[PDB]
Amino acid sequence: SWPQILGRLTDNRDLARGQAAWAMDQIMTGNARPAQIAAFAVAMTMKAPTADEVGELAGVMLSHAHPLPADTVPDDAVDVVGTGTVNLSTMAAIVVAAAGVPVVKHGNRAGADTLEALGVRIDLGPDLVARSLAEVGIGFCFAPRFHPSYRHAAAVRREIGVPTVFNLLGPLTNPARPRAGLIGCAFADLAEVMAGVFAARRSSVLVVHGDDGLDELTTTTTSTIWRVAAGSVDKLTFDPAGFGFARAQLDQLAGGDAQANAAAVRAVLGGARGPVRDAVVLNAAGAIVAHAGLSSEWLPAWEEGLRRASAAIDTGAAEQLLARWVRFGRQ
Amino acid sequence: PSWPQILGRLTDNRDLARGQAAWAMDQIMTGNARPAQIAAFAVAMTMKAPTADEVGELAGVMLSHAHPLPADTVPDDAVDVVGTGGTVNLSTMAAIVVAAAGVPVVKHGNRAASSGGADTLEALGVRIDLGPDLVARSLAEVGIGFCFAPRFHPSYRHAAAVRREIGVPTVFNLLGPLTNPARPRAGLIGCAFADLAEVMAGVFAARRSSVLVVHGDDGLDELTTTTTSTIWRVAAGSVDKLTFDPAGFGFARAQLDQLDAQANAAAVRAVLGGARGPVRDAVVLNAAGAIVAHAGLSSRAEWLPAWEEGLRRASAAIDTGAAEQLLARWVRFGRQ
Ligand SMILES: O=C(O)c1ccccc1Nc1ccc(OCCCP(=O)(O)O)cc1C(=O)O
Ligand SMILES: O=C(O)c1ccccc1Nc1ccc(OCCCP(=O)(O)O)cc1C(=O)O
């Protein structure tokens, strides 16, 4: 019951097995008042959620969500996304796909806004996302379309404004269920929890947190990486200087509205050089490294990832892929 | 100031700045707060661990919006007798006994949506839903009055609703006893939550009230006879933590089970009728506590002598039949 679960949380106790799932299921079946949703969200956040608990929450969401048709998602598909740099992750995603690694993203409007500004059709049913993945090499699951039952939880989150445990679930509830990815987490304390959740489902993932606060591999300083592979977690410090990347300023990597990001995307994929390109290349490589961690060395993998990412841009393959992505939505 | 700012601060486990709790409660009471914001605020403040300043701001806002009793109609030395709950039988009986001893009593409560304070009184034939003028007259003519919460705190209705929806106790559970609209300066105030009792006492202290905030070490929001009780003695803006043992005053230990509105009424009639037992003892104990608190208003009398006088007065109020008569007169007053 709610008094039971909420009571347990306000007493600063971890939940028993299944309780978080029950709570989430009530929320997802419209059997939860806004006050109950809000109380749970806040309490779960201030207690400090466990990997088990967050896993149960994402599990329920995925159990209710629209799936992609059987055998439409390649076994080695990847995600590139952050909890919240949507400009960097959107560009990295295009680059990774152009390098030949299938990419299936999942998001909402406020990084879907940027893709729409670029002329991409973001709101597609499972059948067409599958077609997009196969034919273009990339797909996007529009969260409101795939998680309609979450709308009540979505409204509460906007009403209270502040971040909660629910801010962690985006990368964990991709309806296409990619087994790999580059996952940004702005909250250092929670990044290890997310990595724990990915470890549980045996994903090959790099959970990343810039030491400057970015939910992305940064170039202004070092980054912390929770490398998830073989169901286990390794925590590393990462410095892109080891790969010849010059230090940049934080203000140089920041995003703007959909139109500004769209302009930045066209610039980078058009061959523009500077710190924005560098960050994109770096994060694209990270996703490729995660992809490699599925079927099997750290530095050689990175060096190869950086080559493939840079080439995907310089050959124009990334720019072409975007053009083909746009053209797909019209055909 | 905003909900994101305030809720963000609380979730970061920081105390609020001066005025923020007040701003939040004001929003809640002027209908400018979403149920989700209300619930988030109540839960977040609870898990952060509320301060006396913060709870004081909440109660302060509520009282600033409340309907007052008319000028010069509440005696200087009026007292409250109540618990946070979450012992209505005991506090109701204790209140009648205290009033019959000659200490003006003004209570504050609401009907229960499951049982509560007003329900016991209704079952006894008391008219609970009176306006300020009639509560004032009740207090003057009968020696006791009851402020029906919905009537005096109308703007609080949205907050009260959210309380029930989330179920679990929050800091909001402290506000009832802290927002008696007659603003009595003394009382016996029970708190079921041992952690928040000290906070309550701090709020009363800031007001320079003379109160015993009480928590039975068996969990009762009332002075118990089953074991010891923790009392936060509030007087002269100072809080003093004490442990109270009824055995020190000759009370035999009782079991918890020995302590429904129709059933509460029967228990009230029995005790006021002279029936001996653990229930009477508990009533006499808490009545005496209210009387000790009352004494702390004007005199700096010692702990022991004050209690012994309190116990004598409570017992006499029952044994002379004064308590029984006062209830009857209370019932007749409403029917007039
Ligand atoms: O807004 C609505 O009432 C609604 C109506 C139809 C379909 C979806 C609707 N809202 C949503 C449903 C799911 C959802 O889940 C998206 C997950 C949020 P996150 O990006 O993972 O953090 C978000 C919304 C929304 O209103 O934004
Ligand atoms: O229930 C509480 O937590 C509470 C605490 C302190 C004071 C009053 C409290 N309750 C209420 C206050 C106002 C109210 O308003 C009800 C509607 C009043 P009106 O019809 O507009 O005049 C209802 C309650 C309640 O307990 O349900």
Curated annotation (Swiss-Prot), chain A:
Q: How is the cofactor bound?
A: Binds 2 magnesium ions per monomer.
Q: Which UniProt keywords apply?
A: Amino-acid biosynthesis, Aromatic amino acid biosynthesis, Glycosyltransferase, Magnesium, Metal-binding, Transferase, Tryptophan biosynthesis
User: Per the entry, which co-factors are needed?
Assistant: Mg(2+)
The pathway where this protein functions is: Amino-acid biosynthesis; L-tryptophan biosynthesis; L-tryptophan from chorismate: step 2/5
Which is one Gene Ontology cellular component term of this protein? cytosol
Q: What is its EC number?
A: 2.4.2.18
Give one Pfam hit by family name.
Glycos_trans_3N
The protein's name is Anthranilate phosphoribosyltransferase
Native species: Mycobacterium tuberculosis (strain ATCC 25177 / H37Ra)
